[PDB]
Amino acid sequence: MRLHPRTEAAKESIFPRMSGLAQRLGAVNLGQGFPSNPPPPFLLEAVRRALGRQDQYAPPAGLPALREALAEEFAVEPESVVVTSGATEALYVLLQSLVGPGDEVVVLEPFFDVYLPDAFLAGAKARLVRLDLTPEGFRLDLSALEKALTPRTRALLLNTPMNPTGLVFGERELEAIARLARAHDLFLISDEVYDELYYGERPRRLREFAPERTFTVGSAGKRLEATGYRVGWIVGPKEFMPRLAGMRQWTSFSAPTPLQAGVAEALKLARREGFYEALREGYRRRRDLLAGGLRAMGLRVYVPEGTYFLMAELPGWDAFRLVEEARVALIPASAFYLEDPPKDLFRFAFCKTEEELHLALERLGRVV
Amino acid sequence: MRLHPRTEAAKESIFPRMSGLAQRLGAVNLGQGFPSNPPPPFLLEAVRRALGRQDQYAPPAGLPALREALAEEFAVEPESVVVTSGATEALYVLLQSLVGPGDEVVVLEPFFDVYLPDAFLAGAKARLVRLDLTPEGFRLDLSALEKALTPRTRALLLNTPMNPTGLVFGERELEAIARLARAHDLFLISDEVYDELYYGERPRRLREFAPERTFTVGSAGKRLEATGYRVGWIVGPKEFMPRLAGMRQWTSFSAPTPLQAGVAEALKLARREGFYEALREGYRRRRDLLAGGLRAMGLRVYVPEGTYFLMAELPGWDAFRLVEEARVALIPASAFYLEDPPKDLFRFAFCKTEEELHLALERLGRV
Ligand SMILES: *Cc1c(COP(=O)(O)O)cnc(C)c1O
Ligand SMILES: *Cc1c(COP(=O)(O)O)cnc(C)c1O
Ligand SMILES: CSCCC(=O)C(=O)O
Ligand SMILES: CSCCC(=O)C(=O)O
């Protein structure tokens, strides 16, 4: 008796693997992304208030309260919102409902750890499109993007703000995509879990330009510093939504109720108390600190416009040697690139305390 | 642009759709099974202690504490335990790991609405194996079981205490089933979310007869009256575990940290405080009460051995036409069987207050 060949895709993600390596080595974890602080008090109290009164099942699509709250933020009706057990389940169930054997899916590179595996588990094939790493940071070359479409291609998967690059797609760029989308009738899947986490002008969502074909993915845990709550969501044309609620219902049924209840209150409060504004500033401060401290170490640093990840190049090192000898953990570029990853490109996470970032800066320092 | 054909199965499940109808109609919801009371105090307290301390990502396989708590209850080691976002995810991930294009999966009948869709979504066939229905009650047939076994069969999928029959499989039958599996070199998927909800005698576990190929599935929701916590588990041979964690990794990454944290303490407190003991007590009453009350009316009632459900026969009736006039929710057998499902067989659910049980009978009587 042997497992089905499909299970060849079930390999320990690099993120949780390095997190274990770090505790074991007493290293500073700047790898897997998750805040070192607890989530805001209003979320915790909202969850506390839900325990003992909203502990049982919830409609597969989500608690009405949560849907209504997402509806307002997005300016859509409740029917167009489906609450999943994390953005992770949103992405899996999405690809699952949009591609299959013989179908192609464009995926920008470097990509996010869950895409390819999700694609493969659906049957589709990865149409990687490597962004250029010019001395001014990454950038999408629409020509190279365009040269990658075919009669098979049934969908395009975007990530903005982008993990791990930190790139924020600009208006003109989104047009070009919503455009190409329509031209070949391609589906649009936008991973925007970091929608509220940007450091410049407020980005323009992608559903604006190509509403009829856009699926926008978000995460409560990436919004409210509570990555362990597993409450995510899909927002797209209401006609398809009912099926998606059908899919995710076989995968896990519905998200945790008391957590769905708490996030519901928390999303509205957050919009009223200016929580996202403060969070962004707290992140910009730590972004500049890390990037600035690395700069002083004559390293090449590519300042991000969004998310709490940043990319730098450390000459002549590799994750596993760095974690053991410098006591600092990082995610190696080869985790995002399917082939030939820019040697010496590492990803730093700065959703940590100022003291952890400094500790990393000092340890990396005396290891010239 | 159209959604991939696979979505054929992505059809709203009956249970949440009937609860919406029941609710909306002001009808007693003895359909979808979920307790009317809140989870025990020691589970809420423990979750509360976790909020603020354990809110970030846990490992895909699960929180060390939880895996260890389960490891002790099942007499195995942590590595053979993988925590899932509810049992529902156990099943999905499971069937998706043992069968694909070309494989077949034996399934008993009546079934749990998740079974075929999963098999279906796995790209494999799921030949059924209906059970009998003598006056005594349901009945298994190792013969039919023995027959459905073809060369393409990769695994069987048991479920005891069985939902929706309340049937608690006996030792000789498990063992009998164990034999088949080892002979044909099959996998055994045991859905045991109701392992602690039995009205009879401490039921034996399949894994005691074929521990080398049996995957046991459980659920904190069913054990602890907290169905919305979405914390479940798969306990199987350690050699296959690293893979199962890798599959669920891609589905929902890992279960809710605070809930996993709280369930971990609760599983231990439960044994100690004799919680399960008493949970079985109160479920007995409500079991007897709801069935006797149906005899007084004069119907065919099958007193279950386990679970908090129970099936009965309602003369020339159906589903929606009931939740409209009688204003009481029930589940028609059409959801458990694929074709030609028994006449007038409706599954209730007595995990409600005594009040709700009574008030459900009244509205039943005047019809
Ligand atoms: C964190 C992350 C996810 C997953 O979010 P969850 O809600 O934790 O499952 C998906 N996509 C990207 C790009 C992420 O950074
Ligand atoms: C409740 C139930 C499930 C699902 O359990 P979750 O932990 O809520 O996902 C699966 N199988 C049976 C027989 C059940 O009764
Ligand atoms: C869900 S694993 C971690 C995902 C993430 O935020 C990361 O890119 O580190
Ligand atoms: C499929 S959600 C409901 C699960 C359950 O307990 C039931 O069968 O009623």
Side-chain angles (χ1 to χ4, degrees), chain A residues 71-100:
Chain A
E72 303 177 58
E73 287 197 9
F74 283 93
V76 288
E77 50 257 68
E79 293 69 28
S80 63
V81 182
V82 166
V83 171
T84 61
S85 298
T88 292
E89 188 194 57
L91 288 176
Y92 169 86
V93 169
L94 233 50
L95 281 159
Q96 192 92 335
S97 299
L98 308 189
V99 294

PDB file of all heavy atoms in Angstrom, chain A residues 71-100:
ATOM      1  N   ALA A  71     -18.791  43.258   3.118  1.00  0.00           N
ATOM      2  CA  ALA A  71     -19.564  43.925   2.066  1.00  0.00           C
ATOM      3  C   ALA A  71     -19.336  45.444   2.060  1.00  0.00           C
ATOM      4  O   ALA A  71     -19.039  46.021   1.019  1.00  0.00           O
ATOM      5  CB  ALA A  71     -21.043  43.610   2.238  1.00  0.00           C
ATOM      6  N   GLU A  72     -19.473  46.085   3.220  1.00  0.00           N
ATOM      7  CA  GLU A  72     -19.271  47.532   3.339  1.00  0.00           C
ATOM      8  C   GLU A  72     -17.883  47.953   2.887  1.00  0.00           C
ATOM      9  O   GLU A  72     -17.737  48.880   2.089  1.00  0.00           O
ATOM     10  CB  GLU A  72     -19.417  48.002   4.786  1.00  0.00           C
ATOM     11  CG  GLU A  72     -20.725  47.694   5.468  1.00  0.00           C
ATOM     12  CD  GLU A  72     -20.710  48.146   6.919  1.00  0.00           C
ATOM     13  OE1 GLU A  72     -20.493  49.357   7.162  1.00  0.00           O
ATOM     14  OE2 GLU A  72     -20.903  47.285   7.809  1.00  0.00           O
ATOM     15  N   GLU A  73     -16.859  47.295   3.427  1.00  0.00           N
ATOM     16  CA  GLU A  73     -15.494  47.637   3.064  1.00  0.00           C
ATOM     17  C   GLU A  73     -15.262  47.569   1.571  1.00  0.00           C
ATOM     18  O   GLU A  73     -14.596  48.432   1.010  1.00  0.00           O
ATOM     19  CB  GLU A  73     -14.490  46.708   3.739  1.00  0.00           C
ATOM     20  CG  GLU A  73     -14.299  46.925   5.219  1.00  0.00           C
ATOM     21  CD  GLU A  73     -13.040  46.265   5.706  1.00  0.00           C
ATOM     22  OE1 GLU A  73     -12.256  45.809   4.850  1.00  0.00           O
ATOM     23  OE2 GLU A  73     -12.828  46.208   6.934  1.00  0.00           O
ATOM     24  N   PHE A  74     -15.810  46.541   0.930  1.00  0.00           N
ATOM     25  CA  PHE A  74     -15.618  46.363  -0.504  1.00  0.00           C
ATOM     26  C   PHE A  74     -16.659  47.025  -1.406  1.00  0.00           C
ATOM     27  O   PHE A  74     -16.438  47.169  -2.611  1.00  0.00           O
ATOM     28  CB  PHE A  74     -15.508  44.865  -0.826  1.00  0.00           C
ATOM     29  CG  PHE A  74     -14.164  44.275  -0.489  1.00  0.00           C
ATOM     30  CD1 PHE A  74     -13.943  43.669   0.742  1.00  0.00           C
ATOM     31  CD2 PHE A  74     -13.104  44.371  -1.384  1.00  0.00           C
ATOM     32  CE1 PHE A  74     -12.682  43.168   1.078  1.00  0.00           C
ATOM     33  CE2 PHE A  74     -11.842  43.871  -1.054  1.00  0.00           C
ATOM     34  CZ  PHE A  74     -11.637  43.270   0.180  1.00  0.00           C
ATOM     35  N   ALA A  75     -17.778  47.445  -0.827  1.00  0.00           N
ATOM     36  CA  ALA A  75     -18.835  48.085  -1.600  1.00  0.00           C
ATOM     37  C   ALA A  75     -19.482  47.090  -2.571  1.00  0.00           C
ATOM     38  O   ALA A  75     -19.622  47.366  -3.763  1.00  0.00           O
ATOM     39  CB  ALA A  75     -18.275  49.292  -2.368  1.00  0.00           C
ATOM     40  N   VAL A  76     -19.841  45.926  -2.043  1.00  0.00           N
ATOM     41  CA  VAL A  76     -20.504  44.871  -2.807  1.00  0.00           C
ATOM     42  C   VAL A  76     -21.636  44.379  -1.924  1.00  0.00           C
ATOM     43  O   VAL A  76     -21.791  44.845  -0.802  1.00  0.00           O
ATOM     44  CB  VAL A  76     -19.583  43.675  -3.073  1.00  0.00           C
ATOM     45  CG1 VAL A  76     -18.517  44.043  -4.092  1.00  0.00           C
ATOM     46  CG2 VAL A  76     -18.948  43.227  -1.761  1.00  0.00           C
ATOM     47  N   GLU A  77     -22.424  43.436  -2.412  1.00  0.00           N
ATOM     48  CA  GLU A  77     -23.514  42.919  -1.603  1.00  0.00           C
ATOM     49  C   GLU A  77     -22.979  41.731  -0.828  1.00  0.00           C
ATOM     50  O   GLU A  77     -21.937  41.187  -1.172  1.00  0.00           O
ATOM     51  CB  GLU A  77     -24.686  42.488  -2.491  1.00  0.00           C
ATOM     52  CG  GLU A  77     -24.302  41.577  -3.660  1.00  0.00           C
ATOM     53  CD  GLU A  77     -24.251  42.311  -4.994  1.00  0.00           C
ATOM     54  OE1 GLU A  77     -23.347  43.162  -5.179  1.00  0.00           O
ATOM     55  OE2 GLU A  77     -25.125  42.035  -5.858  1.00  0.00           O
ATOM     56  N   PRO A  78     -23.668  41.327   0.243  1.00  0.00           N
ATOM     57  CA  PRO A  78     -23.211  40.186   1.032  1.00  0.00           C
ATOM     58  C   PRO A  78     -23.066  38.893   0.225  1.00  0.00           C
ATOM     59  O   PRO A  78     -22.186  38.076   0.509  1.00  0.00           O
ATOM     60  CB  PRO A  78     -24.282  40.077   2.111  1.00  0.00           C
ATOM     61  CG  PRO A  78     -24.653  41.490   2.337  1.00  0.00           C
ATOM     62  CD  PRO A  78     -24.769  42.020   0.929  1.00  0.00           C
ATOM     63  N   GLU A  79     -23.921  38.706  -0.778  1.00  0.00           N
ATOM     64  CA  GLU A  79     -23.878  37.494  -1.590  1.00  0.00           C
ATOM     65  C   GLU A  79     -22.560  37.318  -2.322  1.00  0.00           C
ATOM     66  O   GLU A  79     -22.222  36.205  -2.723  1.00  0.00           O
ATOM     67  CB  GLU A  79     -25.011  37.467  -2.621  1.00  0.00           C
ATOM     68  CG  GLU A  79     -26.415  37.350  -2.054  1.00  0.00           C
ATOM     69  CD  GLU A  79     -26.845  38.602  -1.311  1.00  0.00           C
ATOM     70  OE1 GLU A  79     -26.337  39.694  -1.660  1.00  0.00           O
ATOM     71  OE2 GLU A  79     -27.698  38.498  -0.395  1.00  0.00           O
ATOM     72  N   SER A  80     -21.811  38.393  -2.511  1.00  0.00           N
ATOM     73  CA  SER A  80     -20.551  38.260  -3.228  1.00  0.00           C
ATOM     74  C   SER A  80     -19.352  37.982  -2.320  1.00  0.00           C
ATOM     75  O   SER A  80     -18.200  38.048  -2.764  1.00  0.00           O
ATOM     76  CB  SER A  80     -20.288  39.509  -4.059  1.00  0.00           C
ATOM     77  OG  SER A  80     -20.146  40.626  -3.203  1.00  0.00           O
ATOM     78  N   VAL A  81     -19.623  37.659  -1.058  1.00  0.00           N
ATOM     79  CA  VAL A  81     -18.550  37.368  -0.119  1.00  0.00           C
ATOM     80  C   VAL A  81     -18.652  35.984   0.491  1.00  0.00           C
ATOM     81  O   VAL A  81     -19.703  35.585   1.007  1.00  0.00           O
ATOM     82  CB  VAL A  81     -18.501  38.394   1.030  1.00  0.00           C
ATOM     83  CG1 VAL A  81     -17.329  38.065   1.966  1.00  0.00           C
ATOM     84  CG2 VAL A  81     -18.344  39.798   0.463  1.00  0.00           C
ATOM     85  N   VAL A  82     -17.546  35.251   0.419  1.00  0.00           N
ATOM     86  CA  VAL A  82     -17.460  33.900   0.972  1.00  0.00           C
ATOM     87  C   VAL A  82     -16.292  33.840   1.961  1.00  0.00           C
ATOM     88  O   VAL A  82     -15.145  34.134   1.613  1.00  0.00           O
ATOM     89  CB  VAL A  82     -17.254  32.849  -0.154  1.00  0.00           C
ATOM     90  CG1 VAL A  82     -16.826  31.523   0.436  1.00  0.00           C
ATOM     91  CG2 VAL A  82     -18.551  32.676  -0.939  1.00  0.00           C
ATOM     92  N   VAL A  83     -16.597  33.479   3.200  1.00  0.00           N
ATOM     93  CA  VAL A  83     -15.572  33.395   4.233  1.00  0.00           C
ATOM     94  C   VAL A  83     -14.956  32.019   4.293  1.00  0.00           C
ATOM     95  O   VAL A  83     -15.640  31.017   4.511  1.00  0.00           O
ATOM     96  CB  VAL A  83     -16.134  33.761   5.626  1.00  0.00           C
ATOM     97  CG1 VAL A  83     -15.103  33.448   6.702  1.00  0.00           C
ATOM     98  CG2 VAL A  83     -16.502  35.241   5.654  1.00  0.00           C
ATOM     99  N   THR A  84     -13.647  31.989   4.101  1.00  0.00           N
ATOM    100  CA  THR A  84     -12.888  30.749   4.096  1.00  0.00           C
ATOM    101  C   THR A  84     -12.043  30.610   5.357  1.00  0.00           C
ATOM    102  O   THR A  84     -11.892  31.557   6.135  1.00  0.00           O
ATOM    103  CB  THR A  84     -11.936  30.715   2.893  1.00  0.00           C
ATOM    104  OG1 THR A  84     -11.017  31.803   3.003  1.00  0.00           O
ATOM    105  CG2 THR A  84     -12.702  30.861   1.584  1.00  0.00           C
ATOM    106  N   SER A  85     -11.490  29.417   5.547  1.00  0.00           N
ATOM    107  CA  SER A  85     -10.628  29.142   6.682  1.00  0.00           C
ATOM    108  C   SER A  85      -9.233  29.648   6.338  1.00  0.00           C
ATOM    109  O   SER A  85      -8.292  28.870   6.236  1.00  0.00           O
ATOM    110  CB  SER A  85     -10.588  27.649   6.957  1.00  0.00           C
ATOM    111  OG  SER A  85     -11.885  27.176   7.285  1.00  0.00           O
ATOM    112  N   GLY A  86      -9.115  30.962   6.162  1.00  0.00           N
ATOM    113  CA  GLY A  86      -7.842  31.563   5.819  1.00  0.00           C
ATOM    114  C   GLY A  86      -7.710  31.850   4.330  1.00  0.00           C
ATOM    115  O   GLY A  86      -8.423  31.290   3.493  1.00  0.00           O
ATOM    116  N   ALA A  87      -6.799  32.743   3.987  1.00  0.00           N
ATOM    117  CA  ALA A  87      -6.585  33.048   2.594  1.00  0.00           C
ATOM    118  C   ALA A  87      -6.008  31.788   1.931  1.00  0.00           C
ATOM    119  O   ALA A  87      -6.106  31.610   0.719  1.00  0.00           O
ATOM    120  CB  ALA A  87      -5.619  34.222   2.459  1.00  0.00           C
ATOM    121  N   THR A  88      -5.420  30.914   2.744  1.00  0.00           N
ATOM    122  CA  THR A  88      -4.822  29.671   2.259  1.00  0.00           C
ATOM    123  C   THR A  88      -5.872  28.779   1.610  1.00  0.00           C
ATOM    124  O   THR A  88      -5.644  28.212   0.535  1.00  0.00           O
ATOM    125  CB  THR A  88      -4.133  28.883   3.415  1.00  0.00           C
ATOM    126  OG1 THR A  88      -2.980  29.599   3.867  1.00  0.00           O
ATOM    127  CG2 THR A  88      -3.686  27.515   2.952  1.00  0.00           C
ATOM    128  N   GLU A  89      -7.020  28.657   2.270  1.00  0.00           N
ATOM    129  CA  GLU A  89      -8.108  27.836   1.763  1.00  0.00           C
ATOM    130  C   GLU A  89      -8.837  28.529   0.621  1.00  0.00           C
ATOM    131  O   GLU A  89      -9.534  27.886  -0.161  1.00  0.00           O
ATOM    132  CB  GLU A  89      -9.104  27.536   2.869  1.00  0.00           C
ATOM    133  CG  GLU A  89     -10.152  26.537   2.458  1.00  0.00           C
ATOM    134  CD  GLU A  89     -11.304  26.505   3.416  1.00  0.00           C
ATOM    135  OE1 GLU A  89     -11.918  27.568   3.624  1.00  0.00           O
ATOM    136  OE2 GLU A  89     -11.606  25.430   3.963  1.00  0.00           O
ATOM    137  N   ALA A  90      -8.689  29.845   0.539  1.00  0.00           N
ATOM    138  CA  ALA A  90      -9.337  30.620  -0.498  1.00  0.00           C
ATOM    139  C   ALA A  90      -8.609  30.365  -1.795  1.00  0.00           C
ATOM    140  O   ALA A  90      -9.225  30.176  -2.835  1.00  0.00           O
ATOM    141  CB  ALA A  90      -9.277  32.095  -0.156  1.00  0.00           C
ATOM    142  N   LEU A  91      -7.285  30.371  -1.712  1.00  0.00           N
ATOM    143  CA  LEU A  91      -6.428  30.153  -2.859  1.00  0.00           C
ATOM    144  C   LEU A  91      -6.494  28.713  -3.367  1.00  0.00           C
ATOM    145  O   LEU A  91      -6.501  28.477  -4.577  1.00  0.00           O
ATOM    146  CB  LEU A  91      -4.993  30.514  -2.497  1.00  0.00           C
ATOM    147  CG  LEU A  91      -4.680  32.001  -2.327  1.00  0.00           C
ATOM    148  CD1 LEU A  91      -3.247  32.149  -1.884  1.00  0.00           C
ATOM    149  CD2 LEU A  91      -4.893  32.744  -3.638  1.00  0.00           C
ATOM    150  N   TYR A  92      -6.550  27.750  -2.453  1.00  0.00           N
ATOM    151  CA  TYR A  92      -6.623  26.354  -2.856  1.00  0.00           C
ATOM    152  C   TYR A  92      -7.946  26.084  -3.575  1.00  0.00           C
ATOM    153  O   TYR A  92      -7.969  25.593  -4.698  1.00  0.00           O
ATOM    154  CB  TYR A  92      -6.482  25.445  -1.633  1.00  0.00           C
ATOM    155  CG  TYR A  92      -6.804  23.995  -1.900  1.00  0.00           C
ATOM    156  CD1 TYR A  92      -5.828  23.128  -2.380  1.00  0.00           C
ATOM    157  CD2 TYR A  92      -8.088  23.495  -1.693  1.00  0.00           C
ATOM    158  CE1 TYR A  92      -6.116  21.795  -2.652  1.00  0.00           C
ATOM    159  CE2 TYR A  92      -8.391  22.161  -1.958  1.00  0.00           C
ATOM    160  CZ  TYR A  92      -7.394  21.317  -2.440  1.00  0.00           C
ATOM    161  OH  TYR A  92      -7.669  19.993  -2.705  1.00  0.00           O
ATOM    162  N   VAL A  93      -9.039  26.422  -2.908  1.00  0.00           N
ATOM    163  CA  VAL A  93     -10.376  26.239  -3.440  1.00  0.00           C
ATOM    164  C   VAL A  93     -10.635  27.075  -4.702  1.00  0.00           C
ATOM    165  O   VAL A  93     -11.499  26.743  -5.515  1.00  0.00           O
ATOM    166  CB  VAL A  93     -11.402  26.597  -2.363  1.00  0.00           C
ATOM    167  CG1 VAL A  93     -12.787  26.678  -2.954  1.00  0.00           C
ATOM    168  CG2 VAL A  93     -11.349  25.562  -1.261  1.00  0.00           C
ATOM    169  N   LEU A  94      -9.891  28.157  -4.869  1.00  0.00           N
ATOM    170  CA  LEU A  94     -10.072  28.991  -6.045  1.00  0.00           C
ATOM    171  C   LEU A  94      -9.513  28.206  -7.220  1.00  0.00           C
ATOM    172  O   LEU A  94     -10.270  27.761  -8.076  1.00  0.00           O
ATOM    173  CB  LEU A  94      -9.328  30.322  -5.885  1.00  0.00           C
ATOM    174  CG  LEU A  94     -10.140  31.605  -6.107  1.00  0.00           C
ATOM    175  CD1 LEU A  94     -11.424  31.562  -5.290  1.00  0.00           C
ATOM    176  CD2 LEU A  94      -9.304  32.803  -5.705  1.00  0.00           C
ATOM    177  N   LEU A  95      -8.193  28.024  -7.256  1.00  0.00           N
ATOM    178  CA  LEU A  95      -7.566  27.267  -8.334  1.00  0.00           C
ATOM    179  C   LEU A  95      -8.366  26.000  -8.619  1.00  0.00           C
ATOM    180  O   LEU A  95      -8.594  25.634  -9.768  1.00  0.00           O
ATOM    181  CB  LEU A  95      -6.138  26.891  -7.961  1.00  0.00           C
ATOM    182  CG  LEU A  95      -5.139  28.028  -8.139  1.00  0.00           C
ATOM    183  CD1 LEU A  95      -3.905  27.782  -7.299  1.00  0.00           C
ATOM    184  CD2 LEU A  95      -4.774  28.140  -9.593  1.00  0.00           C
ATOM    185  N   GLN A  96      -8.810  25.342  -7.562  1.00  0.00           N
ATOM    186  CA  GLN A  96      -9.576  24.124  -7.705  1.00  0.00           C
ATOM    187  C   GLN A  96     -10.830  24.333  -8.564  1.00  0.00           C
ATOM    188  O   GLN A  96     -11.216  23.447  -9.324  1.00  0.00           O
ATOM    189  CB  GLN A  96      -9.963  23.605  -6.320  1.00  0.00           C
ATOM    190  CG  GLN A  96     -10.520  22.202  -6.320  1.00  0.00           C
ATOM    191  CD  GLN A  96      -9.466  21.136  -6.095  1.00  0.00           C
ATOM    192  OE1 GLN A  96      -8.278  21.333  -6.375  1.00  0.00           O
ATOM    193  NE2 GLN A  96      -9.901  19.987  -5.592  1.00  0.00           N
ATOM    194  N   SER A  97     -11.458  25.504  -8.461  1.00  0.00           N
ATOM    195  CA  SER A  97     -12.681  25.799  -9.220  1.00  0.00           C
ATOM    196  C   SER A  97     -12.448  26.518 -10.552  1.00  0.00           C
ATOM    197  O   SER A  97     -13.396  26.788 -11.278  1.00  0.00           O
ATOM    198  CB  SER A  97     -13.637  26.664  -8.378  1.00  0.00           C
ATOM    199  OG  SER A  97     -14.059  26.036  -7.174  1.00  0.00           O
ATOM    200  N   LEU A  98     -11.203  26.833 -10.885  1.00  0.00           N
ATOM    201  CA  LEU A  98     -10.951  27.568 -12.121  1.00  0.00           C
ATOM    202  C   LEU A  98     -10.014  26.922 -13.145  1.00  0.00           C
ATOM    203  O   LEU A  98      -9.949  27.368 -14.294  1.00  0.00           O
ATOM    204  CB  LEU A  98     -10.430  28.971 -11.789  1.00  0.00           C
ATOM    205  CG  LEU A  98     -11.259  29.807 -10.811  1.00  0.00           C
ATOM    206  CD1 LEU A  98     -10.716  31.214 -10.780  1.00  0.00           C
ATOM    207  CD2 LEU A  98     -12.720  29.819 -11.227  1.00  0.00           C
ATOM    208  N   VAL A  99      -9.277  25.896 -12.745  1.00  0.00           N
ATOM    209  CA  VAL A  99      -8.382  25.243 -13.686  1.00  0.00           C
ATOM    210  C   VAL A  99      -8.429  23.745 -13.518  1.00  0.00           C
ATOM    211  O   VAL A  99      -9.011  23.237 -12.560  1.00  0.00           O
ATOM    212  CB  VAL A  99      -6.922  25.710 -13.525  1.00  0.00           C
ATOM    213  CG1 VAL A  99      -6.806  27.180 -13.902  1.00  0.00           C
ATOM    214  CG2 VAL A  99      -6.451  25.467 -12.100  1.00  0.00           C
ATOM    215  N   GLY A 100      -7.821  23.042 -14.467  1.00  0.00           N
ATOM    216  CA  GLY A 100      -7.805  21.594 -14.417  1.00  0.00           C
ATOM    217  C   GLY A 100      -6.807  21.041 -15.404  1.00  0.00           C
ATOM    218  O   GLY A 100      -5.967  21.784 -15.915  1.00  0.00           O
TER     219      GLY A 100
END
